[PDB]
Design a protein around this ligand. Structure first.
Ligand SMILES: [Cl-]
Lengths: 280, 280, 280, 280, 280, 280, 280
């Protein structure tokens, strides 16, 4: 029998090629869009804030010595760090697969911006890393939690703790999973607090927008007045350059694709941001 | 006594014939329409996707060696298979009842497409069976279920799980029976969550359309972004041929009616589909 | 004293006549108008339907034996029966009260049609009786009932069982009393599911119309797609004739008023009709 | 001292007169306006209705004996009764107090009309009394009540019973007290079904108007299709006449004021009216 | 070191006196505005009402003696009374504090008006006092109360009792305290029957206005058709006069300030007012 | 290696200056705005209020002796106090940072006004402190509470207690945190009484504005008719003066910035202010 | 002999009536005339006294610290009292003698002014009495008397003692009898101490004015600086009013003539007033 198996006639048949490269799920970027954005041409920013206001004003008896008050100020420095990564590709690979280049570009670009989010939110603070929202932030006050509160109640309490600093909250940054569990929250009857089975409620809780990014660690939540608490200072926009002569390269038939960016994350009022943890 | 009895005069009376054959209910097809369609002329398809993106983009000190990143790709093959069935009928019958062939055709056609759905959805993966939505799909995360969730809560949970792929779902495929029990879902008060007795709620749950096909196994549910996860590739449309000489027909006054079709089911993004089981 | 008693002058006084005869509540006919109608001129109808479509289509390996399928058919017969009744009245009565004849006709006609409905629905299917919707119908699936379903829930389930045939339900035929006890259905709070005390809810349950006929025995309920599951075949329109010489009439100054009709109830798709019982 | 009591100057002071007589509350007449009205000039009315329509129409075998049906009629008589009362006052009083004349009229009129309503509803049937709604009315069907029905639920069952006569109900005649208790009906939560503290609900229950007349015995209720079940036949409109010579009047300077009226109450369809008793 | 002590110069410092007197809480007068008002110029008022209307109208046999009816009238007198009080102050106090004069006016005025309310509502009826709404009123009917009625349910029953008179109620006179406790009535769910936390419900219960006056004894309630059940007749408006020579005075350097008013309270229909007690 | 650090070329790089000085959360001032305001030029205020009004106004017979009444008055004193504080700054600092003065002013001005709030609310009476709202206040009436009242219910009762004074409540002075835990108040079913999870309800409870000041002690609540009950009297408006000669300043190049003000808080009607404690 | 004695024409002559009664009243200064006078519209007076004036003024070397002085003040109160008396006279008398009322007025005022002087001097300072000159005075300094010097010498010594107050003595207040004697004081030879009968002046001793008042207790003497150390404050000048209706006047044809006056007296320096006793 003359079949289609490989060891028979299969060879006479060419598999049909499906144009295109199947790109993975592209994550939606945020956080950065929550912050105030500026632009500089220096390697660092300096701003000044009042540190300690010792207000001793009080009532005074006649003929008596009045109270002495004092104010303190401090200078804060925000450095401009550099983020980047590169890739090396065979002169051949690049020539044999044309579109491969434009693909590698769009990936380093995204990748860069992805790790960028990473700093902005959970910025370690260690040596060269940026200091991010979640680090600068003031801890959530465990005392507001009351016997039997829905996770929803907590975020509420949180929006309040921002008020104690005397500023308006801007939004809520929950983890996609946490957000979900909050929406499907029910009442003692069985009804949906945010939205009956027809459709998921919109991304708005307690009057504020809700940003669900995977960037936010599962089980952690961040509430603040972002648009006014911190600011992102761009020194150099993300860019892609290519070198064929970089060291070894020429003599090895190699290319080097580079992608870098220069930022600076400033935190003006940390009292305006809050990080906390749901107690499960 | 001259009556309408058999053993009397009944014989003189001819029963009135009712035109045509009474065809049973025709199941409404679906699954297929949820997928992307296109045709080919090969015995198999080849598409290419990105495998591992090793993104080391990071923060870099001045004068320091930046980080090296990498990308990986893989070629995936999707084979074409063959679906068909045949009927053997006497030469006598066929000649005596004219429109019988016409009917047998329309019947095999349908019957074929019926089983076609079968594969597309519950495609085993063994031997030759197609790799169907339900197999490819990433398993439902039992983790999301919570103490006291309605079946609807789960479908919801599932709609979410699709998000972890970074694409949105496009429909819910439940079994007609399960769908019913979900619609008649009541609250602690005895009210209908979907529709007060006046009329059944539409086929829309959690913002997404609902596809109730018997094809879907009882107690099994499927949620995903079909229109972007898989594609059906037709090689040869459904067709019908007839043979007078097949096997030992000529010598038995027999005909053979054959109906076949050639497909290929491709699965680009599995992470975009989810298979689950109500556990109750 | 000259009074208006009997034994005085009351005799001189003529009672005023109220024109016309006071006719009892006229019942509203229905069952018939739910079915498809057509006339014939035979003593029986014959039609043919598909019985068992054994569809084995499947996936087939290269150069491997394909699956064999089959189809079955059955010839179904539907006899036409005769419904009628007669009345015997005196020549004298008939002559002394002109309008009496007219009345008697309209009455036999109605009374006949009344019992006609009786057959169409609860037709015993036995001896000479017609085969009624309720005998043909496929029994309600007891497995759909769930802990704590209201009567309403059941008709709901029922409306579904019609779907397993692949046809849409047409209406719900309940007993006038049962309909009532359903409307006054309350929730766990004592609220009226269909309509607060303000006004009775319309005769529409689960999107379908509701037909309340006393014909439907209390405790029994019928749901189906009548408009195309059965058909009524009229052989002889209901008519009225009169004989003066019947039996020994001529010699007793008697008249005989006869009213007959010839029907036939055909049942094409039984899977499209469902009968059940409320077990309270 | 010159005081304003009797013995002193009290006399010089004239009390101020409040114009007009203070009439007691006037009940609002109703039960009459519910029935159909008509004129007559007779001593009584006669009408004819069908009694037993023995309808045996059925299915009949071939060459078999048809079934015999029958009809029964009866003659019903409604007598005309007389209601009235007179009042005699002195010629002096009548001449000295001008408006007393008219006042006395409006009173006898109303008074008559009051007892009139009395007959119409609770008409004994004994001797000379009229036969009224509540007597004729068909007894409520205790079998419709169900464990845990509100008084409202009953009146609903009632409105239905009217339907078993194939006629629509016209209104509900309750006792002002009972109506009240029904409006303040509450649910298991404590909310008012019709009420809701802001204001009393309108006089409409189950789609029908509600007539609250004291005439209706406390604890008794009447539902029916009045405008089509009974008719009031007026022989003589309520009138007022005066006589100066009536018996020893002329010689006693006396007057006699008379007020009479002639009615007849007919009850065509009794099955259209229902009388019941709240049992609790 | 001279300061503001009593030892240094704080003597040369005289406090600044805040102009005028601090008048206490002036309550809202009401009871009066509920009643019909009119003026007169007499020692008292006389009005005439119907007493016993003996209506014997009935059904009368033929040529039989008809029923005799009767009407009784009575003349009711309503006397005018005098309400007043005076206050004497030293010529010195009066001359030394200029505005003390006008203050004593506004106080005697208000004070008078206050006790006026006193009579109008809870008027004793004894000796020289007035008969007040509450004395004349017909007692509440304890039999209307039902197992578990709210205080509101009662006032409701009350509003009905006013119907047995055949007039509509006009308002509800409750005690400020009782009102409050009613407004905050809740359901078994914890919801506010009259108004969710946002705002106190308006002073309207069962469709009627509500007057909360301290005048009304705590635990007591009054519902009636005030606007036309009683009427207030003014003979002399409240007036303030001053005497320099009253008895001693001239020789005791004293002044006498007098404030009087002349009323008359008429009660046309007592069956129109109800007085009851929340018994709990 | 030519780098950016200090040892290399860093020096050539000028950090970008963020214009402006970062001021902390500025608290919103209130309370003072709830009170009536006025001037004065003394070191204390003296006002007069009515104490006991013995109103014997009554009904009097003719020629009868009228009743005598009386009025009592109290004199009350409210002293003027002095609140202030000063800051000593270098002459150089002040000239080298132009806007530093402008800032120090708004900073003292504020701090002053802040401790001012302090007195006005939680006064004391102790020596130099002001006697404030919460001290003068009338105790909350514990008898108004009822089995199962929510915090809200209490403020409600409180808003009533202010009625006994015969004045209207003006606002509710809660502690920021209490207000929060009040808004998130839920019902027996679990849904939010004030705002669901959509958005925070506005600062309005029982129809009155809500004033949340940190000044108000946690757990303490104050309801009253502020705009009527008390009045703030200013002797000296909060002002700021500067001296270059104070003490040994001239010779040490120092400035002294002084900020003081002279108040006096008067409480006319205490019955109009209620203070209470939430017992958790 | 027509003469003018009784028995003749003496009757023709009517005596002329001397128009007007000559009113008494000495020509002398009054304890009043000696004091400073003012006016007030108040119930009392609040003045201030200088107590201790530590005057350390002195000579000072340049570059040297100057001397500190100090002043002490004290707050004093002085109430206003009332002096008055009335006369009851016949209305007839008062009309028949016109000049009579004019007298009674002046005479009642004169008499008032006497008792006025009385309080101004020997004012008990107790209950209703005024705080008089003598109650305040510092006692005379016996240590100034010389071996054998006249009563005159003493008053002279007193005039000196005043000086130690820092005020000049204004006048002398002796008893009439005493003054009469002190004036006729002679030496051991007969020459008058004062001035011979040649050019005798008046009430002037030691160049001061002298008030000879029977108010000044015999044997007592008052010397001080009246014109400045103390002053009279008038609230109401002496006035006369009349009442025709006073108590039972109207009905007795009587008139009541009242004469009152109200003042107060303040003493700014007691040390400036001196009282002593003549030891003889
Ligand atoms: Cl000499």
């Amino acid at each position: 029998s003359l079949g289609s198996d490989a060891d028979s006639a299969g060879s006479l048949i060419q598999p049909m090629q499906i144009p295109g490269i199947i790109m993975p799920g592209l994550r939606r970027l945020t956080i950065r869009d929550l912050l105030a954005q500026g632009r500089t041409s220096s390697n660092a920013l300096e701003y000044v804030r009042e540190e300690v206001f010792t207000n001793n004003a009080d009532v005074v008896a006649e003929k008596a010595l009045k109270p002495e008050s004092d104010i303190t100020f401090s200078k804060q420095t925000a450095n401009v760090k550099t983020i980047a990564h590169w890739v090396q590709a065979s002169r051949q690979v690049m020539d044999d697969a044309p579109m491969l280049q434009s693909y590698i570009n769009n990936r380093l670009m995204y990748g860069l911006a992805l790790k960028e989010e990473g700093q902005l939110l959970n910025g370690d603070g260690t040596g060269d890393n940026l200091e991010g929202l979640n680090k600068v932030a003031t801890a959530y006050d465990t005392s507001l939690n009351a016997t039997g509160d829905t996770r929803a109640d907590i975020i509420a309490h949180a929006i309040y703790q921002v008020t104690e600093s005397e500023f308006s909250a801007s939004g809520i940054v929950l983890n996609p999973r946490d957000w979900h569990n909050i929406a499907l929250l029910k009442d003692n009857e069985g009804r949906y607090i945010f939205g009956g089975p027809q459709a998921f409620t919109s991304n708005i809780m307690w009057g504020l927008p809700v940003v669900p990014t995977k960037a936010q660690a599962a089980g952690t939540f961040t509430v603040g007045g972002f648009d006014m608490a911190s600011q992102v200072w761009d020194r150099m926009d993300a860019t892609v350059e290519v070198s064929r002569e970089d060291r070894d390269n020429f003599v090895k038939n190699m290319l080097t694709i580079l992608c870098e960016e220069r930022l600076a994350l400033a935190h003006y009022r940390p009292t305006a941001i809050i990080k906390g943890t749901f107690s499960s």
